[PDB]
Amino acid sequence: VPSQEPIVVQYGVRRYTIQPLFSQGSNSPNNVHKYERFLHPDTVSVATCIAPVDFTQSPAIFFKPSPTDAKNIELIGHGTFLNADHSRILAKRAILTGHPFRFHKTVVTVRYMFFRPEDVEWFKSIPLFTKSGRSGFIKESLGTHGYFKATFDGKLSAQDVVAMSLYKRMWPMPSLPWNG
Amino acid sequence: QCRVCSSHTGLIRKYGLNICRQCFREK
Amino acid sequence: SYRGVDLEKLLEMSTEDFVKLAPARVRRRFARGMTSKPAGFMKKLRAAKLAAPENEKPAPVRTHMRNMIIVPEMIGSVVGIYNGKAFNQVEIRPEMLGHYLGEFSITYTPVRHGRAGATTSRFIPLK
Amino acid sequence: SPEEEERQLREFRDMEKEDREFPDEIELEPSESAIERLKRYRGLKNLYNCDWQVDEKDPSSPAEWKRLLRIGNYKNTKNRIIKETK
Amino acid sequence: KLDTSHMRYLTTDDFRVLQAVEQGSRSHEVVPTPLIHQISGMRSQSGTNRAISDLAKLSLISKMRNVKYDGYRLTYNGIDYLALKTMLNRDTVYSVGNTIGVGKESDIYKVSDKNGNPRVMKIHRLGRSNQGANWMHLSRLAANKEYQFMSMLYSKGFKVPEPFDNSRHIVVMELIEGYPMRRLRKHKNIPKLYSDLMCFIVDLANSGLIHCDFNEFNIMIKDKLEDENDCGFVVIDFPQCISIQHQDADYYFQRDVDCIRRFFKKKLKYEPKPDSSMLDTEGFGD
RNA sequence: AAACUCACCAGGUCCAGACACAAUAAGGAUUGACAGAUUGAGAGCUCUUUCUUGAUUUUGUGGGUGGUGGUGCAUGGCCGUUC
């Protein structure tokens, strides 16, 4: 189920059609999260929403409000009322693209990266990092149909991702009390 | 070069001998 | 205006004659051989004055070299000329005399010696 | 609506990877613009090391976020809330 | 020559390490392998040889595999990158580069401060570089000693520029928009400033250090004020400084009388007006 | 040092389906000693508008025969290199 959608949350028994924001339920040291749009089919998810709060850590049941099966519920998923916290904060990621057009040594001519000239020139303040993690900064670029000129650990290939950074922050969504 | 190296710097087209300026004291 | 001497003498000259009075680095060009590359240019010129609002502005017909010499005869037509990529619109007049069409070029985003702002884009921000 | 559970079921369960791999890729056709869509928010270094915050001053804050009981911590008020009943 | 572009791949893994190992390579030259973790209290195998293999290519450290006395050394960038890192640590340098200027053990590196006005990171590397047993020992301490001997007339009423920090080779000198005496063309008050060259060494004998070394690059008519051109003096005359006890002042005192007689006369054909002064007064009036 | 050199650039196209069977396959699929349109910033090429064609080969396709992709991994002598 896509995870920007109203799911009827129970944390315990009572029902509210809340509009959550699921994020990855990994072991988080810094307690800093994501605005992950949608779901992952196995692991733990961490919702983020506004609810009118019943503060006793229940096994949460999230479902769809219909008498679909012989159960009068469509059970979407069980989990844990983790907390109610303001400083449990989000950061949506980006991964941009770099498709290396050749096999160079130091300066890699990358195309399929930047079309427009004011999208070439003004967007030269973005940190260059490879999908392998080779961080760095843009020193030049000229490409039109978008190049660069930087210095990384080794060499690059046409199946690599010379990514760039947009780490943006969307904002959460409130509940809806469903009783019927 | 003569096939026992990957020699890419100081290349030679002069006089067919394929021995570098850096290879008068090697080759 | 070509020399100051009579204008009904000078305008339709080819690559032959006065340069045999001129010195041999620009005599071993213009008094050897006409190089008739502007001869079928007249045949496209004679249509580049017909269907205009006349005497004023014809169309920017493109031309992509750097050692080709235009002759003044053709008062009232427009040709777009090589500047490295694009085609500078020239209303062709007797106001260019034996100098290159491909001299219309200073091809750089300008040399930053007074405002060095693109040099600031190559330096090191550092973690 | 069951037809769009075969029409849009092509996408509205398989766009779940638009979150994962290309989350906020400025996607590039010659018609799509780069400036306008992903414009109005920071770009720090690393999610396990950076610094994002709680209460900015924007219209992006919803109704019972900027009219909150701003919960301090849960774990540092569950002792309060439960011990209000203990 | 120079490398600069082998630094920005790190994390916190080297920031706790540095001045613990910089005060640890001084307490204990060439450091063996399992000590980078344990001088800094960094843990044994939580992102560790990943980070040391990250440091390995960067030439601020090198894998000196000797026979059980291994080497991890904080090549020449163990001073150079890590003093850039030190000025990132001692709150002066925020990134690297708007820099133009060339010497031998003094490169002028034009920077902008924490404030915003510019200054200059001069760097000390003698022998070019030759950085060895005393060459590192010099550029560590000649950055520290000449942090102590650029205030000998600033307190006493005269013009010596001020040093700011002494990080490992780096000496930061405002920045001075000078005009040396080979760049200038004309002057408005000529005969004052010839007799003030007898009189500057008069000022130098008050502090007890006579300076001599005057070539055509020396006396900067600088830019304190840009618009109204309230200029000043930068006197690059320092390194011919001699303790007067030594037996060479027989021809240092006579330099103060009959050796400056060419430049205001010839450079500025205009035969000069003024008087002069000796330094026999300054022997007693210190 | 000239355009080439000369490792880069401002704009275009000669050209990709073989091997099987599947649509048309010899009423023109696709072939050529030629006549024009030919031009993209200056070209050879094509065969809709003479006619060689000669069974053969045209294409939405995948194993991959096509390693004229070898960077190679070392393996086998052989000599720059290390002694």
Look at A96 and D25 and tell me if their CB atoms are within 8 Å: yes
Domain count, chain C: 1
Round and report the angstrom distance from CA (E128) to C1' (F54).
82
Closest listed residue to residue A51, CA positions, set A90, A87, A21: A21
Tell me how far apart the alpha carbons of residues C85 and C87 are, in angstroms, rounded to a whole number.
7
| Interface test mutation site (partner A, options C121, C123, C124, max chain A beta carbons within 10 A) | C121
Closest listed residue to residue E201, CA positions, set E257, E265, E261, E275: E257
* The dihedral formed by the CA atoms of A96, A100, A101 and A105, expressed in degrees to the nearest 10: 150
With distances taken from each CA to the C1' atom of nucleotide F71, the closest residue turns out to be: A103
Element (H, E) at E24: helix E18-27
Tell me how far apart the alpha carbons of residues A129 and A164 are, in angstroms, rounded to a whole number.
6
| Contact indicator for A78, A60 with CB cutoff of 8 Å | yes
What are the C-alpha distances in Å from E187 to residues A176, E184, E262? Answer: 84, 8, 16
What are the C-alpha distances in Å from A93 to residues A98, A156, D36, D54? Answer: 17, 24, 18, 17
What are the C-alpha distances in Å from D24 to residues A22, A161, A170, D3, D28? Answer: 16, 15, 11, 30, 12
Tell me how far apart the alpha carbons of residues E68 and A86 are, in angstroms, rounded to a whole number.
54
For residue A64, list chain D residues with Cβ-Cβ distance below 8 A. Answer: none
CA of C87, closest CA in chain A: separation in Å?
20
- Which is catalytic among the residues E14, E70, E165, E213? E213
Look at A151 and E9 and tell me if their CB atoms are within 8 Å: no
The gap from C-alpha A175 to its chain's centroid, in whole angstroms, comes to 21
Look at A137 and E8 and tell me if their CB atoms are within 8 Å: yes
Closest listed residue to residue C74, CA positions, set C116, C45, C99: C45
Look at A137 and C124 and tell me if their CB atoms are within 8 Å: yes
CA of A93, closest CA in chain D: separation in Å?
6
For residue C122, list chain A residues with Cβ-Cβ distance below 8 A. Answer: 139-140
What are the C-alpha distances in Å from D61 to residues A171, D36, E180? Answer: 7, 21, 61
> Which of E5, E8, E57 is facing A135, going by the closest CB pair?
E8
- For strand A99-100 and strand A110-111, is the pairing parallel, antiparallel, or unpaired? antiparallel
List the domain range (segments joined by +) for residue C98.
1-127
CA of E52, closest CA in chain A: separation in Å?
14
Between C and E, how many CB-CB pairs are < 8 A?
22
Tell me how far apart the alpha carbons of residues D62 and D85 are, in angstroms, rounded to a whole number.
31
| Neighbour-count burial of A4, counting CB atoms closer than 10 A to its CB (0-12 exposed, 13-18 middle, 19+ buried) | middle
Q: Is E165 a known active-site residue?
A: no
Round and report the angstrom distance from CA (C61) to C1' (F40).
15
- Residue B3, nucleotide of least CA–C1' distance: F80
- Residue B2, nucleotide of least CA–C1' distance: F80
Residues 6+ apart with CB under 8 A from E254: none
Element (H, E) at E108: strand E107-112
- Phi and psi at residue E108, in whole multiples of 5°? -85, 110
Tell me how far apart the alpha carbons of residues A38 and A155 are, in angstroms, rounded to a whole number.
34
- Phi and psi at residue A100, in whole multiples of 5°? -65, 120
Task: Indicate the angle between helix axes E77-89 and E135-145, nearest 10 degrees.
Answer: 30
Tell me how far apart the alpha carbons of residues E162 and E147 are, in angstroms, rounded to a whole number.
8
Q: Does the beta carbon of C33 lie under 8 angstroms from any beta carbon of chain A?
A: no
* The dihedral formed by the CA atoms of E179, E182, E185 and E186, expressed in degrees to the nearest 10: 80
**Identity at E271, one-letter amino acid code:** E
Tell me how far apart the alpha carbons of residues A99 and A161 are, in angstroms, rounded to a whole number.
6
